[PDB]
Design a protein around this ligand. Structure first.
Ligand SMILES: *[C@@H]1O[C@H](CO[C@@H]2O[C@@H](C)[C@@H](O)[C@@H](O)[C@@H]2O)[C@@H](O[C@@H]2O[C@H](CO)[C@@H](O[C@H]3O[C@H](CO[C@H]4O[C@H](CO)[C@@H](O)[C@H](O)[C@@H]4O)[C@@H](O)[C@H](O[C@H]4O[C@H](CO)[C@@H](O)[C@H](O)[C@@H]4O)[C@@H]3O)[C@H](O)[C@H]2NC(C)=O)[C@H](O)[C@H]1NC(C)=O
Ligand SMILES: *[C@@H]1O[C@H](CO[C@@H]2O[C@@H](C)[C@@H](O)[C@@H](O)[C@@H]2O)[C@@H](O[C@@H]2O[C@H](CO)[C@@H](O[C@H]3O[C@H](CO)[C@@H](O)[C@H](O)[C@@H]3O)[C@H](O)[C@H]2NC(C)=O)[C@H](O)[C@H]1NC(C)=O
Ligand SMILES: C[C@H](NC[C@H](O)CP(=O)(O)CC1CCCCC1)c1ccc(Cl)c(Cl)c1
Ligand SMILES: *[C@@H]1O[C@H](CO)[C@@H](O)[C@H](O)[C@H]1NC(C)=O
Lengths: 403, 407
């Protein structure tokens, strides 16, 4: 039973905050590995996932990668990269060791650049993947005029910059573009003054409470307004200076949140024989005391992407692995071409890549009285939107007008 | 009886954004021969070089950093060139307790001791232009300054430093404008706000676009002074660009009278340095070692800094004198070379070599003015000693420089 070694890179230590992603996804990884092994899908071989802790740090992450090459077995590919600056360093160097990388949690749009990161793939949609979903939401409700409110931090300005290209050649005007660093009120007053009704917000959880306080003060809420903001904030994020909690909630009422879909809502059997719901129960049992992670399905599908890639790679060599050292350009190219062919129905929906980027599912939510409720989903492969019939609501007789 | 070999792991950019390794690798090789032949420097040791071509690329440099660290012999120092390469190797270095000495990195971000705790550079930070800028404002009595920048990290960091330095001198930044590739709007906005003293930070391609836009809006003349970087090619405005509407004569008109700041990299004086060479002998010796002409050789002007980097290291190693026992798991030797490197003070081919608290090079700046489509040397400034070398060669319309506002 020869091994097919894989270099697992992720923060794993309790001392590191993003160690919760790496630990939260491992039961999902264990489940996928265990199944593939039982079924002897990679017969005669077996999947050998070796784990190395990056500690979510550039220097330690790089040393973990280097040590893995020096003292570890001959890895055929890299699985992981969670923290954006660590993943960028490893991803950029990949061709030096002919290593294809598959990430399940690095969402930074920067990684889509195939001139800089040609050997990098990811099962998770990037922070920019919400922009094609928002366009469909705007088209659905006949919102042709929008305003933008963006925090002056790279994570958010990347997203706003991508929105420009997504809305070009579409019948949607960005009538007002406003930026802020610490206080959004000046920009919120400018939006009000320019009579903006539909606002596309890109800012962190801390700034969101400030944005909605300014919205209450400027009366930028209710039947005439629609705020479309990030959907990745922690639950009860608002509860955690001039506004009252009741006034913040009144301004928050009806906001649409947008983020990737953690798992498929389709009750259909996936590549493993299990429905996403059956997988979710198996994951929740296996995790025990370890806190769940929203990337677990992306990590589970990631293992299946690797096993299916290795299968295609084994077929390509048989149509004409042990001898592969980081020296073999041809095998890295075979693996690279094999991964580009990925096309199966996973727990996160249909797993397909478009230039190393995941074509996946975007979830829409709406803040309704006390919490965010799912109101719809965007399928990036089909470029289609499905709104949940009797969930999404408006304070007026019709959804708001854009002017 | 036996001289022990001690090794430098260097990275040279032979191609890419700044192909500085073309002249810096032979400058380094020349300095190693000069240091090794001197018995009063490191008599018990022989400084040797192990090097790779980074191609001014961090991805490419990641492969060679591994090759340097995971292969015998153990290296005692790392020597990268490009800022993007130094940012990668200088942050990674603490995991191997290695000093990093760059001969070509200008990035202001490399002056952060938290991210880069063992970093030094014989090339100054791009922020070295700022004390010369504040001193020029003080000389011509200006307290209101406008700033236009291309959207790049270096220019953003340089302006951030210019903000804290003007505040110290009782000078304020009136308006700050930025552009990614196309100016026009910031240039239009500069005429709009009636800005007179303008600091413009951009690369040469963007400078042409800026000054073509400066022409149309008539932002040149007696009313305004432009402060630019001095390392563009000779006759950069005269250079043909299909994306510029303005002509050679139009651009020549828009650029007249602008001031530039640039780092002095070769001592203008005819004095002899620690190697016992003059600036002119270094240049002559380096030209002989080159396959191509100095003009066709990348990093020719920075070559004295690479030569001086080797001497700074040799002198530091000389001050410490147990070099063979260096290991990546131990800090003891590193801390001693850090201390010796920090206390560097000597005369190199690039002039007096000293680092600030951040490990960044302190040097003279050359101040120039574009008089009749050509640059004339109007002065030099020494930030550490507050010493301004003034030559009465500066010229302005109406026999005097204008003012910052309405008057
Ligand atoms: C730092 O720089 C210069 C380097 O000199 C030159 O530059 C290099 C780039 C190469 O091209 C070199 O080949 C070249 O030398 C050094 O200065 C020279 O070094 C020595 C120092 O003593 C001088 O050599 C002779 O000096 C005296 C007398 O020189 C007389 O003649 C010259 C003109 O030819 C006059 O200008 C002088 O004023 C003076 O009248 C002479 O007695 C020595 O000769 C020998 O005498 C013994 C006889 O019994 C012999 O047994 C010994 O071999 C002894 O050497 C020297 O030949 C040389 O003139 C100066 N040149 C200049 C320009 O100053 C400098 O020393 C060096 N510093 C170091 C190495 O630390
Ligand atoms: C990398 O993958 C790209 C996408 O591949 C497609 O999707 C995968 C999920 C998988 O299902 C795979 O089998 C699919 O081909 C490749 O680009 C695609 O290349 C196709 C040609 O091989 C092309 O198709 C053509 O098919 C017929 C030809 O007449 C037409 O019906 C059709 O219009 C196309 O012309 C397909 O368009 C193209 N995809 C895109 C979006 O451009 C890519 O070549 C591949 N590279 C590798 C494996 O090295
Ligand atoms: C004085 C300076 N010396 C080298 C510089 O610090 C290397 P750097 O810090 O890596 C910045 C480069 C990279 C991109 C293109 C040019 C600038 C310099 C600056 C700009 C130019 Cl065009 C040159 Cl040739 C040299
Ligand atoms: C090198 O160190 C020795 C030891 O003290 C000293 O004598 C010598 O002068 C130093 N070399 C230089 C040129 O400073």
């Amino acid at each position: 039973s020869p091994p097919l070694s894989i270099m697992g890179l992720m923060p794993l230590t309790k001392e590191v905050a993003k160690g919760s992603i790496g630990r939260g996804v491992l039961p999902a990884v264990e489940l996928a590995i265990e199944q593939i092994r039982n079924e002897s899908l990679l017969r005669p071989y077996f999947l050998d996932l070796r784990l190395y802790d990056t500690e979510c740090d550039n220097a330690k992450g790089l040393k973990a990668f280097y040590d893995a090459i020096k003292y570890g077995p001959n890895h055929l590919m890299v699985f992981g990269g969670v923290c954006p600056s660590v993943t960028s360093i490893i991803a950029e160097s990949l061709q030096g060791w002919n290593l294809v990388q598959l990430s399940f949690a690095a969402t930074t749009p920067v990684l889509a650049d195939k001139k800089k990161y040609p050997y990098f793939f990811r099962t998770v949609p990037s922070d920019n993947a919400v922009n094609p979903a928002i366009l469909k939401l705007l088209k659905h409700y006949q919102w042709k005029r929008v305003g933008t409110l963006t925090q002056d931090v790279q994570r958010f300005s990347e997203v706003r910059n991508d929105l420009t290209g997504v809305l070009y050649g579409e019948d949607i005007e960005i009538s007002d573009t406003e930026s802020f660093s610490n206080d959004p009120c000046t920009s919120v007053k400018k939006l009000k003054g320019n009579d903006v009704r539909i606002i596309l917000g890109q800012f962190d959880q801390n700034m969101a409470a400030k944005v909605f306080c300014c919205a209450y003060e400027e009366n930028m809420y209710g039947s005439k307004y629609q705020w479309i903001i990030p959907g990745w904030y922690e639950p009860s994020w608002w509860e955690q200076s001039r506004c009252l909690r009741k006034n913040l909630l009144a301004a928050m009422e009806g906001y649409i949140g947008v983020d990737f879909e953690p798992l498929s809502s389709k009750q259909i059997k996936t590549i493993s024989g299990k429905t996403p719901q059956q997988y979710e129960r198996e994951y929740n049992n296996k995790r025990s005391g370890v806190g769940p992670s929203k990337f677990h399905g992306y990590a589970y599908d990631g293992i299946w992407v690797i096993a299916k890639t290795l299968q295609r790679a084994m077929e390509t060599l048989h149509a004409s692995i042990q001898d592969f050292n980081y020296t073999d350009h041809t095998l890295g190219r075979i693996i690279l071409n094999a991964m580009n062919e990925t096309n199966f129905f996973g727990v996160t929906g249909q797993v397909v890549f478009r230039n190393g980027e995941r074509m996946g599912t975007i979830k829409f939510t709406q803040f309704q009285d006390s919490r965010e409720v799912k109101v719809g989903e965007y399928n990036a492969v089909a470029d289609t939107l499905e709104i949940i019939n009797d969930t999404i609501r408006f304070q007026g007789s019709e959804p708001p007008k854009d002017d | 009886s036996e001289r022990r070999a001690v090794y430098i792991g260097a990275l040279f950019p032979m191609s890419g954004g700044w192909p500085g390794g073309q002249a810096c690798q032979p400058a380094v090789e020349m300095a190693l021969e000069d240091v090794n032949s001197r018995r009063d420097i490191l008599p018990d040791y022989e400084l040797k070089l192990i090097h790779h071509d980074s191609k001014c690329d961090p991805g490419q440099a990641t492969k060679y950093l591994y090759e340097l660290l995971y292969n015998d012999p153990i290296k005692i120092i790392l020597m990268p060139g490009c800022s993007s390469v130094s940012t990668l190797v200088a942050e990674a270095a603490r995991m191997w307790n290695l000093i990093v000495l760059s001969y070509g990195s200008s990035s202001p971000a490399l002056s952060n001791r938290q991210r880069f705790p063992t970093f030094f550079r014989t090339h100054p930070s791009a922020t070295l232009h700022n004390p010369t800028r504040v001193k020029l404002f003080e000389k011509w009595g200006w307290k209101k300054i406008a700033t236009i920048q291309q959207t790049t990290e270096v220019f953003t960091s340089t302006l951030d430093d210019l903000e804290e330095r003007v505040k110290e001198a009782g000078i304020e930044i009136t308006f700050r404008q930025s552009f990614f590739s196309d100016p026009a709007v910031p240039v239009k906005n500069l005429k709009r706000q009636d800005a007179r003293i303008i600091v413009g930070l951009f690369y040469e391609t963007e400078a042409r676009k800026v000054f073509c836009e400066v022409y149309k809006e008539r932002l040149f003349g007696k009313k305004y002074v432009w402060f630019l970087i001095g390392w563009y090619a000779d006759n950069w405005f005269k250079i043909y660009d299909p994306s510029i509407n303005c002509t050679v004569d139009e651009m020549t008109e828009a650029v007249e009278g602008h001031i530039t700041t640039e780092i002095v990299m070769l001592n203008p004086a005819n004095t002899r340095s620690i190697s016992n060479m003059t600036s002119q002998e270094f240049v002559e010796k380096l030209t002989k070692r080159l396959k191509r002409h100095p003009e066709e050789t990348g990093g020719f002007q920075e070559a004295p800094l690479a030569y001086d980097a080797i001497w700074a290291l040799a002198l530091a190693l000389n001050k410490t004198s147990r070099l063979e026992d260096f290991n990546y798991n131990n800090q003891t030797i590193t801390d001693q070379i850090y201390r010796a490197m920090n206390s560097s003070s000597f005369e190199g081919v690039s002039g007096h070599v000293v680092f600030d608290a951040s490990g960044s090079r302190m040097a003279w700046t050359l101040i120039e003015q574009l008089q009749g489509g050509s640059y004339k040397k109007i002065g030099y400034y020494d930030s550490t000693k507050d010493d301004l070398s003034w030559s009465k060669t500066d010229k302005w319309i109406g026999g005097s420089p204008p003012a910052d506002d309405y008057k």
